[PDB]
Design an enzyme around this catalytic site. Structure first.
Site, PDB file in Angstrom:
ATOM      1  N   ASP A   7       0.859  -1.138   0.000  1.00  0.00           N
ATOM      2  CA  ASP A   7       0.000   0.000   0.000  1.00  0.00           C
ATOM      3  C   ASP A   7       0.913   1.210   0.000  1.00  0.00           C
ATOM      4  O   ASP A   7       1.731   1.333   0.893  1.00  0.00           O
ATOM      5  CB  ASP A   7      -0.889  -0.098   1.245  1.00  0.00           C
ATOM      6  CG  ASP A   7      -1.999   0.930   1.248  1.00  0.00           C
ATOM      7  OD1 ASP A   7      -1.772   2.075   0.862  1.00  0.00           O
ATOM      8  OD2 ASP A   7      -3.127   0.554   1.594  1.00  0.00           O
ATOM      9  N   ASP A  99      -2.372   2.960  -6.086  1.00  0.00           N
ATOM     10  CA  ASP A  99      -1.483   2.843  -4.932  1.00  0.00           C
ATOM     11  C   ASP A  99      -1.558   1.532  -4.176  1.00  0.00           C
ATOM     12  O   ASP A  99      -1.168   1.467  -3.019  1.00  0.00           O
ATOM     13  CB  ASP A  99      -1.634   4.029  -3.996  1.00  0.00           C
ATOM     14  CG  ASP A  99      -3.066   4.264  -3.601  1.00  0.00           C
ATOM     15  OD1 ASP A  99      -3.945   3.467  -3.991  1.00  0.00           O
ATOM     16  OD2 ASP A  99      -3.308   5.230  -2.856  1.00  0.00           O
ATOM     17  N   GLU A 100      -2.004   0.464  -4.838  1.00  0.00           N
ATOM     18  CA  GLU A 100      -2.245  -0.802  -4.130  1.00  0.00           C
ATOM     19  C   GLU A 100      -1.903  -1.991  -5.040  1.00  0.00           C
ATOM     20  O   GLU A 100      -2.382  -2.060  -6.167  1.00  0.00           O
ATOM     21  CB  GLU A 100      -3.722  -0.906  -3.721  1.00  0.00           C
ATOM     22  CG  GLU A 100      -4.178   0.053  -2.652  1.00  0.00           C
ATOM     23  CD  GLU A 100      -5.682  -0.034  -2.496  1.00  0.00           C
ATOM     24  OE1 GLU A 100      -6.425   0.361  -3.427  1.00  0.00           O
ATOM     25  OE2 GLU A 100      -6.099  -0.605  -1.501  1.00  0.00           O
TER      26      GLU A 100
END
Length: 336
Positions: A7, A99-100
């Site tokens: 993350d 973002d993951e």
């Protein structure tokens, strides 16, 4: 199975600071267009600005922060390099969003100790190459790896071993489970279904009647400690569901509820994909399709989807004479 979730912490804010070094140490607020807070950096958060709030509210809390407009193209460039970095640690990658990312590292490591060290090495590699901190969660499946990251963020690393998965199944409330909201939790509360394990005390048909088929299957497989969804990036031009009705019908009122079940499942499956287009799909009694859709200037809220879907189904009922056997929706044209 050993899954490692990554993350990127406050990703847009970190990118703005890497790109503009003189902003480091100052409150920085990245805005979505008012207008809302996309992300707030370390100083902005410290002084009371949170993501999701109106910019007008952000400026009342912290009048003199540095307010920047979102540069998603730039953030995407950085993101893609980081995902590239991550493939060299495993080829089984699922890019969940900007973002993951999830990695299946079952073949890269022997145990959770080795998983942990690899998580450390990934953190060091990304910091060295992209000047960005990340959180790593590690567990036996994607869901518990994501819970891990949420226990550790920002700039953290956490393992949920097999024994901790079992404690968590017993202790986690429904609202704590990734992808499941408070509305869903509140309905289940009404039944005394409070903990994740409590989903095993209810008949499947009853559970799905209240919360939908997809959410029911999801919660049950998790509570059974049987969730093992493969880690791969998919690849969706469309998200939809088609439901077979009990009977052939042309009755708009008799048809509505199945349409809604289709919309509810579709929206759960959207995640935070925002569709601009929707089509109602009717499978006629002779097994042909009649379909009608609309493309909005704006992303479709789930409300806009209910309203519109009835309008499109009404058009179908008017411009075609056959009875309808199955009914569903398709959402497409996702921003960005």
């Amino acid at each position: 199975m050993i899954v490692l979730f990554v993350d990127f912490d406050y990703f847009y804010a970190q990118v703005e600071e890497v790109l503009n070094p003189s902003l480091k140490g100052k409150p920085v607020v990245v805005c979505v267009f008012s207008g809302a807070v996309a992300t707030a950096n370390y100083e902005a958060r410290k002084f009371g600005v949170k993501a999701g709030i109106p910019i007008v509210e952000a400026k009342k809390i912290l009048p003199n922060a540095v307010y920047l407009p979102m540069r998603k193209e730039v953030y995407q460039q950085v993101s893609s390099r980081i995902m590239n970095l991550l493939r060299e640690y495993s080829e089984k990658i699922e890019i969940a969003s900007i973002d993951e990312a999830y990695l299946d590292i079952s073949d890269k490591v022997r145990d959770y100790r080795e998983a942990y060290n690899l998580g450390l090495e990934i953190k060091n590699k990304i910091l060295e190459k992209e000047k960005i901190t990340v959180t790593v969660g590690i567990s036996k499946n994607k869901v518990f790896a994501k819970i891990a990251a949420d226990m550790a963020k920002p700039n953290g690393i956490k393992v949920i071993d097999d024994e901790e998965v079992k404690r968590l199944i017993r202790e986690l409330d429904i609202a704590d489970v990734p992808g499941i909201g408070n509305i869903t939790a509140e309905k289940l509360k009404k039944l005394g279904i409070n903990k994740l394990v409590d989903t095993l005390s209810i008949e499947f048909d009853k559970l799905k009647g209240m919360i939908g088929e997809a959410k029911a299957k999801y919660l049950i497989s998790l509570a059974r400690d049987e969730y093992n969804e493969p880690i791969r990036t998919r690849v969706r031009k469309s998200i939809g569901r088609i439901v077979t009705m009990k009977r052939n019908s042309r009755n708009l009122e008799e048809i509505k509820p199945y349409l809604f079940r289709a919309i509810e499942e579709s929206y759960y499956k959207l995640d935070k994909r925002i569709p601009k287009a929707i089509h109602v799909v009717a499978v006629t009694e002779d097994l042909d399709i009649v379909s009608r859709g609309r493309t909005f200037p704006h992303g479709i809220s789930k409300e806009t989807a209910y309203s519109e879907s009835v309008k499109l189904l009404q058009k179908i009922l008017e411009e075609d004479e056959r009875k309808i056997r199955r009914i569903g929706v398709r959402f497409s044209k996702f921003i960005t």
